Design a protein around this nucleic acid. Structure first.
Ligand SMILES: [Zn+2]
Ligand SMILES: [Zn+2]
Lengths: 127, 214, 100, 24, 199, 96, 91
RNA sequence: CUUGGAUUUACUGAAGACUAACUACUGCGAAAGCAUUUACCAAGGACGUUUUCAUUAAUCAAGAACGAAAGUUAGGGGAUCGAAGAUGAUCAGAUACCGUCGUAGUCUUAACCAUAAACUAUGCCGACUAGGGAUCGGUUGUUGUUCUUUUAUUGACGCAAUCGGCACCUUACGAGAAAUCAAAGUCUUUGGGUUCUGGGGGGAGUAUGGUCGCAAGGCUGAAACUUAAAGGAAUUGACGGAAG
C-alpha cells in the first residue's frame, strides 16, 4: 500500500534532529536539523526551525518514493532530561501538514534502570 | 555530485507464516556490484514492527516484534523472529502507585536450540469490594509468584520449538496460564510477557526457514 | 525556630534516604524531601489532533500518552512556581489543591 | 567570619606551630 | 632455584613401552602429593588437569597455556599468574584469552592449559629489605646485580656519563630505530612521567 | 539433626572411637552403625566399608572432618571414625 | 612478659630499614612462620618449606600454596569458580 | 569535535559502576545505614503459649564493639562524575558562580581513621493522665465480596477486637518566655531510679602537658587580657533582584 518510512525525531533543548530512515533504520534517507535552517545558536531547537527541517525532509521523502512514516520521538534520555524539547511538537505537526502519511507514534527516550552520576555535581548548577 | 539515491535498489520484507500480515514493507540498499554483493550486505538486518501490523487486529498494538532477515530470494527477504518488546507508553501505563510490581526473568533454550530470555511482569489486582488505599502483596508472596512464573516460562519454552513459541506468544498463551497458577497466592492483573530476547542461535537451517515461509 | 514539625521532609522511623537529582539542575535532594509530580501528557497539542488524525494510515488510532514523574528540589520547584509560599496556618494543609 | 572557615583557618595556623616546634 | 613458582614431578605410564615417564609441571596452588592428574581431551574440569582451551568454558582460570599446539607451555607460568579464557570461535576453532599483562590473544582451541593458579603468589608483597637478599636472589638467576647508574660513569662507558654534574644531558627517550650502544634509557617510550589515570 | 541423635547416643548408649576399635567391633559383629568422618583417607574408608559390607552393617558418612566429629561426641580430641555398639535412648539407628 | 610492644617478629631487624618496611614485613612473616591446620589429617602441623611448599609433619602430604600463606585469596576464588563451572558442564 | 564524515541512524561487542518507575507522613537495624534475582550461612523483633528458671534486673565511672562522607596505607579496577590543574566566557577585577576537559577520589580487597546540623537539636528504664481515624506484623471471631475448581481445608477482600510499632488529626485538663508540647504533662501542691553536661559574651576548643593515630587529626584542656552586653521567642514597621 503506502511506502512506510521511519521518521526518528530528536527533540533536545538545544537542537532538533529530523531523521527519516527505512524500517530497519540502517539506511538513511533524509536528516535535516534545526541548525541547518537558522544562523543563530539560540533558536536551533525553536519550533520555527523545527517545521523548516520537517518540511525539507518531507519533500526529500516524496522525491525518493516515501509516502508514509512511523514516528520515533525521543528526548536526550540517558541521565539527562526525559521530556521532549519544544522542536518535537511543531516538526511532527509540520510533518502531518506536509502531505506525508503518519503511522505509529511511540516515545523511545532512553531510560536508565537505576544510572551513572549525572553531571552538575551534588549542589547542581547554580545560576 | 553523485546523487547517492540513484544506486539504491528496493527489496521486499516477508514475515513467516506464523504471522498473518506477511507483507511487512520495503527496504533499500546499494545495487550489487562485483566487489560487494547486495545480498550479503542486506541480510542480518533487524526490523522493529508492531504486532498489530503483523496481525491486523489493533488489540496487539502495544507489542512490537523485531524481525531478522537471514535469507534473500531475489527482490524478497525471508525473515525470522528476532525478539519481542512492549511499547514504552504501555509499560509506563502499567506501573501505577499503591500496587505491587512483580517481575521475573529466566534464560532458557528451546527444542531447536534457540536460547531466550523471557521477561514476565505482573501486578496485584484490586478487589471490587476493597476499601483500603493501597494493594500491596507481602514480600514472601511476591517471591512465590516470582517462583511460579519462572518454573512456567521454563516449562512453556523448553518444551516447544521457536516457531511453535511464536504461536503461543501472540495470543498470550503463557500469560494466561501464569495468572491461573498465581491465583491461589494473590489475585493478579495485567500478567504479560513484556520482553523476549534472542541470545544464541543454532547452526543455520535455511531449509527450515523456507518451511516457515510457504 | 522550628518552621515545620516534619522538618521539611518525610523521614520518620528511618535513618537515611537515598537522594535524587533535581530535574532542573541535577542537585542531590533526599527522595522523601523532593517535590514529586506525576505527569501524563499527550504527545501532540490538542490543536494537533485534527491534522494527525487525517494523516493517519490507521483507522481510529489512539494517541499514546507521555508519562513522566518529575523531581524538584525546594529551589527548583519554588522558582518554577510548582509550590508557593503559604501562610503560617495554611502551611499545615497538606490536602492537594483542587484543580482537576 | 564563617564558623567553618575559622575552624579551618586555625588548623592551618595550628599546623604552622607544630612545624616550628619541630625545628628545636 | 631461581623460580618463584614451585614445580611438581608427575609420573605417567608410557602408552607404548613398559616404562614410567616423568614430567615436570608448574605446580598450581592447591595441588598435593599423591593427587591424580588427568591430561587429555576428555579430562574433567578440575584443578591441575591439562585440557585443551576449547574444552574449557568461558571464565575458566588456566595456567601454563600453549601459544602454539604442542609447544608445551608458553603463557602464565610465574607464581600467582594465570590466564582467563574470554571467549570461543568454534567455527574458526579459536579462543580469546586474557594474558597476565592485560593483553587479549587469539589461540588455537587445540592448545593446552592447566587448570588453576600458579602457586607461590604474593611473593612480591614482602620487601627484600637487604642488599644481601637481592644478592642471594640473583645468585641463582644470572649476573645482573648490582647495577651502576650510567649517569655515574664516564663518557666511554655510557651515553649518560660525563659532565661536572650527574645529568643525562639529552632526552632519555630513545628511538626504536637507534642502534646498539645508543639504546640506554627509555626505548621507544610512548609517554613518560608518573602514570595518572587509566591506561 | 544427626548431630543431636549422635550426642544422645554418646551420653546414653555404647560406642567405640577409633579405627582399631571399630574394625574389632565389626569382626565381632557387635557394630550396629559405623560413622566415618569426611577427611578420613579413602583407602581406610574403602576398607571400613568392605568390613561393614561383609558384616552387613549400615554406614553413615559424617559431613564434617575428624575435628568436627570428635567434638560432636563430646571429646577434646579428634575422632576419625566410630562404631555405635548399643543405641540407647537415642534413635540414631532408625534414621541413619 | 610482653617483650616487644609492636615489632614482634621484626624485632630481629633492630632500628634499620624503616618503620613502614618492617611493619610490612611483620604482617607477611607471621603468616609464613605459623602452623596451619592440615586439610588431610586434621592436625595443625602444616609448615612452609620454600615458597609455595607447605608440608605436614604428620601425614607427609605436601600441598602447593601461596608464598607466605597456605592459600592465597585468589586461589580460593578459583576453586569455587571452577567448581560451579564444572557443575554446569556436568549438569 | 567536524568532507580525514562530526552530530544523527541501526546492528554488534566490551568495561566498570548503579539498581529508575513500583517508592509511601511505608518496612528492617543499636546507631551509622539498608532497594535486581536466586542459593547458601548464621542472627532478630513482634505475635501465639494453661512450656521452662525463679529476681537472674535498670542506669551505669573505668574499659570495649560498631560507627556516613571525606581522608591515609598496599594491591586490583578506573565506565561516568569530578577536589587540584588548565582552559572559554561574564566582570573594573574574578585564578568564583556558567561552559569544556580533566588528576586524586568515587568502586573493591586487607588494614587505619573515630569525626558530622552523627538532629527527634528532645538520655535511658518505669507507672499514670484525652479523644479520633488510618497504617505495618502477629493473633482471635464474623461476609449480598472475588477466587482455587465445582466447593470446602485456598487466597485476596470486608467487618470487628486486641498486643506490639512508625506515626498522624483535634482540644489544652496541664506546661512553657513563646514558638509550641499526649510529652516539653503528673514540676514553690517543689522527691519513681539513674548516667552525662552548662554557669554572661569573647579570648577558645586556642596555648601547654598527657594520651591514641602513619599522618590528617581525635580525646582531655586553661590562663592572661577584654567586654555590658551577646542571645531566645514573639510584635509593629521598614525593606526584598519572593508569591498572590
Ligand atoms: Zn538547588
Ligand atoms: Zn596432615
Amino acid at each position: 500500500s503506502q511506502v512506510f518510512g521511519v521518521a526518528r525525531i530528536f527533540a533536545s533543548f538545544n537542537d532538533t534532529f529530523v531523521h527519516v530512515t527505512d524500517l530497519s533504520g540502517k539506511e538513511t534517507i533524509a536528516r535535516v536539523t534545526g541548525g541547518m535552517k537558522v544562523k543563530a545558536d539560540r533558536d536551533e531547537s525553536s519550533p520555527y526551525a523545527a517545521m523548516l527541517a520537517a518540511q525539507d525532509v518531507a519533500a526529500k521523502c516524496k522525491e525518493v518514493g516515501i509516502t508514509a512514516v512511523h514516528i520515533k520521538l525521543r528526548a536526550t534520555g540517558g541521565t539527562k532530561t526525559k521530556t521532549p524539547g519544544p522542536g518535537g511538537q511543531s516538526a511532527l505537526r509540520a510533518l502531518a501538514r506536509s502531505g506525508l502519511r503518519i503511522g505509529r507514534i511511540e516515545d523511545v527516550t532512553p531510560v536508565p534502570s537505576x544510572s551513572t552520576r549525572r553531571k552538575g555535581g551534588r549542589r547542581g548548577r547554580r545560576l | 555530485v553523485v546523487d547517492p539515491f540513484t544506486r539504491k535498489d528496493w527489496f521486499d520484507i516477508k514475515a513467516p507464516t506464523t504471522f498473518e500480515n506477511r507483507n511487512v514493507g520495503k527496504t533499500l540498499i546499494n545495487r550489487s556490484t562485483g566487489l560487494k554483493n547486495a545480498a550479503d550486505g542486506l541480510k542480518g538486518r533487524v526490523f522493529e514492527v508492531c504486532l498489530a501490523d503483523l496481525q491486523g487486529s489493533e488489540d496487539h498494538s502495544y507489542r512490537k516484534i523485531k524481525l531478522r532477515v537471514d535469507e534473500v530470494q531475489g527482490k524478497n527477504l525471508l525473515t525470522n523472529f528476532h525478539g519481542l518488546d512492549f511499547t514504552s507508553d504501555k509499560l509506563r501505563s502499567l506501573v501505577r502507585k499503591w500496587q505491587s510490581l512483580v517481575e521475573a526473568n529466566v534464560t532458557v533454550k528451546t527444542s531447536d536450540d534457540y536460547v531466550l530470555r523471557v521477561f514476565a511482569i505482573a501486578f496485584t489486582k484490586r478487589q471490587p469490594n476493597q476499601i483500603k488505599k493501597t494493594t500491596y502483596a507481602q514480600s514472601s508472596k511476591l517471591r512465590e509468584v516470582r517462583k511460579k512464573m519462572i518454573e512456567i516460562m521454563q516449562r512453556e519454552v523448553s518444551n516447544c520449538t521457536l516457531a511453535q513459541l511464536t504461536s503461543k506468544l501472540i495470543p498470550e498463551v503463557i500469560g494466561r496460564e501464569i495468572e491461573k497458577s498465581t491465583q491461589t497466592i494473590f489475585p493478579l492483573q495485567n500478567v504479560h510477557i513484556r520482553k523476549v530476547k534472542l541470545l544464541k542461535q543454532p547452526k543455520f537451517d535455511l531449509g527450515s526457514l523456507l518451511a516457515l515461509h510457504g | 525556630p522550628k518552621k515545620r514539625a516534619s522538618n521539611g521532609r518525610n523521614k520518620k522511623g528511618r535513618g537515611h534516604v537515598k537522594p535524587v537529582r533535581c530535574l532542573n539542575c541535577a542537585r542531590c535532594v533526599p527522595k522523601d524531601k523532593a517535590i514529586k509530580r506525576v505527569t501524563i501528557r499527550n504527545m501532540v497539542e490538542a490543536a494537533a489532533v485534527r491534522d494527525l488524525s487525517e494523516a493517519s494510515v490507521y483507522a481510529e488510532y489512539a494517541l499514546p500518552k507521555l508519562y513522566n514523574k518529575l523531581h524538584y528540589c525546594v529551589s527548583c520547584a519554588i522558582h518554577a512556581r510548582i509550590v508557593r509560599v503559604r501562610s503560617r496556618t495554611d502551611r499545615k494543609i497538606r490536602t492537594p489543591p483542587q484543580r482537576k | 567570619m564563617r564558623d567553618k572557615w575559622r575552624k579551618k583557618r586555625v588548623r592551618r595556623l595550628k599546623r604552622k606551630r607544630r612545624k616550628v616546634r619541630a625545628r628545636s | 632455584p631461581g623460580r618463584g613458582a614451585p614445580l611438581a614431578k608427575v609420573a605417567f605410564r608410557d602408552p607404548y613401552k613398559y616404562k614410567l615417564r616423568e614430567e615436570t609441571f608448574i605446580a598450581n596452588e592447591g595441588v598435593y602429593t599423591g593427587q591424580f592428574i588427568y591430561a587429555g581431551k576428555k579430562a574433567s574440569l578440575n584443578v591441575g588437569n591439562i585440557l585443551p582451551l576449547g574444552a574449557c568454558p568461558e571464565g575458566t582460570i588456566v595456567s601454563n597455556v600453549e601459544e602454539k599446539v604442542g609447544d608445551r607451555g608458553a603463557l602464565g607460568r610465574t607464581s600467582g599468574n594465570y590466564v582467563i579464557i574470554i571467549g570461543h570461535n568454534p567455527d574458526e576453532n579459536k579462543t580469546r584469552v586474557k594474558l597476565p599483562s592485560g593483553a587479549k590473544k587469539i589461540i588455537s582451541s587445540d592448545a593446552r592449559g592447566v587448570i588453576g593458579v600458579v602457586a607461590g603468589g604474593g611473593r612480591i608483597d614482602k620487601p627484600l629489605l637487604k642488599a644481601g637478599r637481592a644478592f642471594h636472589k640473583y645468585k641463582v638467576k644470572r649476573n645482573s646485580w648490582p647495577k651502576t647508574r650510567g649517569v655515574a660513569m664516564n663518557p666511554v662507558d655510557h651515553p649518560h656519563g660525563g659532565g661536572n654534574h650527574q645529568h643525562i644531558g639529552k632526552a632519555s627517550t630513545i628511538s626504536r630505530g637507534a642502534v646498539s650502544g645508543q639504546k640506554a634509557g627509555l626505548i621507544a617510550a610512548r609517554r613518560t612521567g608518573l602514570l595518572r589515570g587509566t591506561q | 539433626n544427626i548431630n543431636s541423635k549422635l550426642a544422645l547416643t554418646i551420653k546414653s548408649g555404647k560406642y567405640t572411637l577409633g579405627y582399631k576399635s571399630v574394625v574389632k567391633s565389626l569382626r565381632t559383629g557387635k557394630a550396629k552403625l559405623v560413622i566415618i568422618a569426611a577427611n578420613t583417607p579413602v583407602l581406610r574408608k574403602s576398607e571400613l566399608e568392605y568390613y561393614a559390607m561383609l558384616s552387613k552393617t549400615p554406614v553413615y558418612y559424617f559431613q564434617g572432618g575428624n575435628n568436627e566429629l570428635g567434638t560432636v561426641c563430646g571429646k577434646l580430641f579428634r575422632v576419625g571414625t566410630l562404631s555405635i555398639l548399643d543405641a540407647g535412648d537415642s534413635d540414631i539407628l532408625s534414621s541413619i | 612478659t610482653k617483650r616487644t610492644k609492636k615489632v614482634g617478629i621484626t624485632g630481629k631487624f633492630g632500628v634499620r630499614y624503616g618503620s613502614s618496611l618492617r611493619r610490612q614485613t611483620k604482617k607477611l612473616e607471621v603468616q609464613q612462620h605459623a602452623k596451619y591446620d592440615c586439610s588431610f589429617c586434621g592436625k595443625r602441623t602444616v609448615q612452609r618449606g620454600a615458597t609455595g611448599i607447605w608440608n605436614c609433619k604428620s601425614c607427609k602430604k605436601t600441598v602447593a600454596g601461596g608464598a607466605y600463606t597456605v592459600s592465597t585469596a585468589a586461589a580460593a576464588t578459583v576453586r569455587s569458580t571452577i567448581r560451579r563451572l564444572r557443575e554446569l558442564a556436568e549438569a
